[PDB]
Scaffold this active site. Structure first.
Site, PDB file in Angstrom:
ATOM      1  CB  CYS A   1      -0.541   7.866  -6.027  1.00 20.10           C
ATOM      2  SG  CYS A   1       1.073   7.406  -5.377  1.00 20.10           S
TER       3      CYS A   1
ATOM      4  CD  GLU B   1       2.132  -0.093   2.859  1.00 22.72           C
ATOM      5  OE1 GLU B   1       1.059  -0.076   3.494  1.00 22.72           O
ATOM      6  OE2 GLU B   1       2.190   0.074   1.623  1.00 22.72           O
TER       7      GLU B   1
ATOM      8  CG  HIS C   1       8.401  -1.133  -5.057  1.00 17.44           C
ATOM      9  ND1 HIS C   1       7.461  -1.636  -4.184  1.00 17.44           N
ATOM     10  CD2 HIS C   1       9.570  -1.100  -4.374  1.00 17.44           C
ATOM     11  CE1 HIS C   1       8.036  -1.897  -3.024  1.00 17.44           C
ATOM     12  NE2 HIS C   1       9.316  -1.583  -3.112  1.00 17.44           N
TER      13      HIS C   1
ATOM     14  CB  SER D   1       4.899  -2.009  -8.505  1.00 16.38           C
ATOM     15  OG  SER D   1       3.801  -1.159  -8.170  1.00 16.38           O
ATOM     16  CB  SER D   2       2.225  -4.162  -3.705  1.00 18.08           C
ATOM     17  OG  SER D   2       1.010  -4.732  -3.232  1.00 18.08           O
ATOM     18  CG  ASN D   3       0.412   0.407  -7.145  1.00 14.90           C
ATOM     19  OD1 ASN D   3      -0.046   0.752  -8.240  1.00 14.90           O
ATOM     20  ND2 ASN D   3       1.629   0.738  -6.744  1.00 14.90           N
TER      21      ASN D   3
ATOM     22  CG  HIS E   1       5.353  -4.633   0.133  1.00 16.37           C
ATOM     23  ND1 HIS E   1       5.486  -3.338   0.587  1.00 16.37           N
ATOM     24  CD2 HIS E   1       5.061  -4.541  -1.187  1.00 16.37           C
ATOM     25  CE1 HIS E   1       5.285  -2.501  -0.415  1.00 16.37           C
ATOM     26  NE2 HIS E   1       5.027  -3.204  -1.502  1.00 16.37           N
TER      27      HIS E   1
ATOM     28  CG  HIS F   1       7.883   1.412  -0.454  1.00 14.40           C
ATOM     29  ND1 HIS F   1       9.074   1.780  -1.041  1.00 14.40           N
ATOM     30  CD2 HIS F   1       7.019   1.176  -1.470  1.00 14.40           C
ATOM     31  CE1 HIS F   1       8.936   1.773  -2.355  1.00 14.40           C
ATOM     32  NE2 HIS F   1       7.699   1.410  -2.642  1.00 14.40           N
TER      33      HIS F   1
HETATM   34  C1  DMA Z   1       2.074   2.616  -0.880  1.00 17.77           C
HETATM   35  C2  DMA Z   1       3.080   3.142  -1.870  1.00 17.77           C
HETATM   36  C3  DMA Z   1       4.335   3.751  -1.262  1.00 17.77           C
HETATM   37  C4  DMA Z   1       2.848   3.068  -3.202  1.00 17.77           C
HETATM   38  C5  DMA Z   1       3.760   3.560  -4.300  1.00 17.77           C
HETATM   39  O1  DMA Z   1       3.884   2.567  -5.328  1.00 17.77           O
HETATM   40  P1  DMA Z   1       5.021   1.444  -5.290  1.00 17.77           P
HETATM   41  O2  DMA Z   1       4.872   0.549  -6.589  1.00 17.77           O
HETATM   42  O3  DMA Z   1       6.340   2.127  -5.283  1.00 17.77           O
HETATM   43  O4  DMA Z   1       4.911   0.606  -3.907  1.00 17.77           O
HETATM   44  P2  DMA Z   1       3.939  -0.679  -3.757  1.00 17.77           P
HETATM   45  O5  DMA Z   1       4.754  -1.913  -3.959  1.00 17.77           O
HETATM   46  O6  DMA Z   1       3.412  -0.648  -2.255  1.00 17.77           O
HETATM   47  O7  DMA Z   1       2.701  -0.708  -4.746  1.00 17.77           O
HETATM   48  S1  F3S Z   2       2.359   6.664  -2.204  1.00 22.23           S
HETATM   49 FE1  F3S Z   2       0.667   6.208  -3.495  1.00 22.23          FE
HETATM   50  S2  F3S Z   2      -0.516   4.348  -3.755  1.00 22.23           S
HETATM   51 FE2  F3S Z   2      -1.199   5.156  -1.857  1.00 22.23          FE
HETATM   52  S3  F3S Z   2      -0.435   5.086   0.198  1.00 22.23           S
HETATM   53 FE3  F3S Z   2       0.735   6.753  -0.724  1.00 22.23          FE
HETATM   54  S4  F3S Z   2      -0.745   7.228  -2.139  1.00 22.23           S
END
Ligand code: DMA
Ligand code: F3S
Ligand code: DMA
Ligand code: F3S
Lengths: 309, 309
Positions: free
Chosen positions: B12, B126, B41, B225-227, B124, B74
């Site tokens: 992203c 964030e 992450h 990684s949450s997402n 988390h 984060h």
């Molecule tokens: C919001 C954010 C910084 C996303 C980047 O992915 P990540 O896997 O490093 O973090 P997350 O655990 O929030 O999905």
């Molecule tokens: S790092 Fe990536 S997943 Fe979303 S909030 Fe920022 S764009």
């Protein structure tokens, strides 16, 4: 005379993308390339693109079949978009992503048959395009420009009401309209604050800082640029003579006559080369080296569609 | 066996920027460069940066004076930010702008002394950083993860309440929590929908389309990684066998034996090379040419700070 430069100033991400879309289309398909409305509200940019083969029109009926048409950064209504679709035309959309964002919210309200209120200036292409996203007859789409307009607006059902705003409005004035809306329709829903984009908010913050130091403020931008006009207006409200100019040629000696500090900024649609020429002119008029003020750093970039790389 | 690739997938704008900040800091200042918490992450990314000279630490107190420190994508709490500011360190903030956006709203609420509710997962980084933006003792900052948590929540003044959300949550699940919040606190204020970023929304939309064709879905991403977890979760909830993997080496033959169609996607923090390697592995296991599905185009880019370009 001291020359101060607002920071940030000039090109935003939507404008850089829109201009690049036209330039790339020209490089790939060659002239002519049709564009609905000035790609961005800047005479220099438009004049330059026209010289390169871009033809700017207001209605799709002005575009020949088989031609390539690009929608300006300000966006277009669904009627315009559908008219182009029904026609034999290759279309590329340079609408700024932040304008599209508002479009989607309006479309959503329309689908739900719930009324929406847009805060914006009548006649502006962005307003026409955004209001043009609402088509459900059972609902409603209303435009308000001031608290007074809110005071006289009546809706079918204020229990299901939402609002959106133009991206280039005065942050302060818009806040007052929203306060009025919430006082009038306590159940109205919308964004946390408004739909004014980062670039608009940042440049207004920047010109406010510039104005508390400069006696006179020059805003590089065209007369039909909403965001540019708001920059000049903000400085004028602070008691500083402010002028909206297209280029260094518009600067009148009397404006900086015996002025010890002049400030310069630029609207989101004004190329940096114009600012550089304005600074050079001010220097011919006694100004020293231009001093950039410290400001909010911007890091957003919007890429052109892969189809136009 | 047919190989399908989700679109969009992978990096992203926030992650690309965060990694670039660490890479450029290393290139410019050389090793060592200290980073508070994993920049993103992803095991591969962190391991690579470590091999290049980046030192990941847990507390700013572990960083020596005169060093370069980088905040992860984060985000961090105000307490952490102030600790770094009082230290003799050069700090570069790789917090994603979209996280900073939420931080701003929380700070705003704290200033006004109005209570705020954050929808997110306890523990988390964030969530720690975002809740860490609230300081006003006269107000309150609460965390809720489910509708049930909303039902049991006790606040000081329901008349002045606002909510925010983590950027990487399940769009559908968060919708449920928000419905509960508005049902419980009819006067609560927040964004139009949520604070889930475009990348998260888009990747979930993309994996949904992928899971409709694939029998098995591989999601490239780390366990923390949450997402990434939400992508695997979404595919599994659609009735497809989903696997969260760090790299091609994790793939087990049995997972795809006899499978006619396998889909591949990647979380926002997973490099494309990992996806390429996964595809290669699937191909030696009988897979054919990887077929990218049509998807929502992304055009957002976040530049690194001018000092690090
Ligand atoms: C919001 C954010 C910084 C996303 C980047 O992915 P990540 O896997 O490093 O973090 P997350 O655990 O929030 O999905
Ligand atoms: S790092 Fe990536 S997943 Fe979303 S909030 Fe920022 S764009
Ligand atoms: C929102 C948008 C497309 C801004 C570009 O600047 P502009 O001067 O061309 O347009 P505006 O009149 O909205 O400020
Ligand atoms: S809405 Fe878009 S084009 Fe420029 S001034 Fe704002 S970014």
């Amino acid at each position: 005379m001291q020359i101060l430069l607002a920071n940030p100033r000039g090109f935003c991400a939507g404008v850089d993308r829109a201009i690049s879309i036209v330039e790339n289309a020209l490089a790939i398909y060659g002239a002519p390339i049709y564009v609905r409305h000035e790609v961005v509200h800047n005479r220099y940019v438009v004049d330059s693109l026209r010289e390169r083969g871009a033809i700017f029109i207001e209605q799709i009926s002005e575009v020949p079949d088989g031609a390539i048409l690009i929608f300006s950064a300000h966006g277009v209504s669904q009627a315009v978009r559908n008219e182009a679709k029904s026609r034999d035309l290759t279309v590329f959309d340079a609408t700024c992503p932040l304008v599209t964002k508002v479009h989607m919210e309006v479309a959503r309200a329309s689908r739900r048959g719930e009324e929406s209120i847009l805060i914006g200036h009548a006649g502006h292409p962005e307003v026409e395009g955004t209001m043009g996203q609402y088509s459900n007859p059972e609902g409603g789409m209303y435009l308000v420009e001031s608290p007074d307009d809110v005071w006289k607006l009546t809706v079918k059902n204020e229990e299901k009401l939402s609002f959106m705003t133009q991206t280039t409005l005065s942050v302060d004035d818009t806040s007052d309209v929203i306060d009025a809306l919430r006082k009038r329709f306590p159940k109205i829903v919308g964004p946390r604050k408004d739909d004014i984009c980062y670039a608009t908010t940042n440049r207004q913050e920047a010109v406010r800082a510039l104005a508390e130091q400069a006696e006179v403020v020059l805003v590089v931008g065209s007369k039909n640029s909403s965001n540019s006009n708001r920059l000049a207006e903000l400085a004028q409200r602070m008691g500083k003579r402010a002028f909206l100019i297209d280029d260094a040629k518009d600067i009148q000696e009397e404006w900086v006559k015996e002025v010890k500090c002049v400030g310069v900024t630029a609207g989101a649609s004004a190329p940096d080369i114009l600012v550089q020429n304005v600074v050079a002119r001010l220097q011919q008029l006694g100004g020293g080296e231009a001093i950039p003020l410290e400001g909010r750093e911007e890091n957003i970039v919007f890429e052109v569609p892969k189809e136009l790389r």
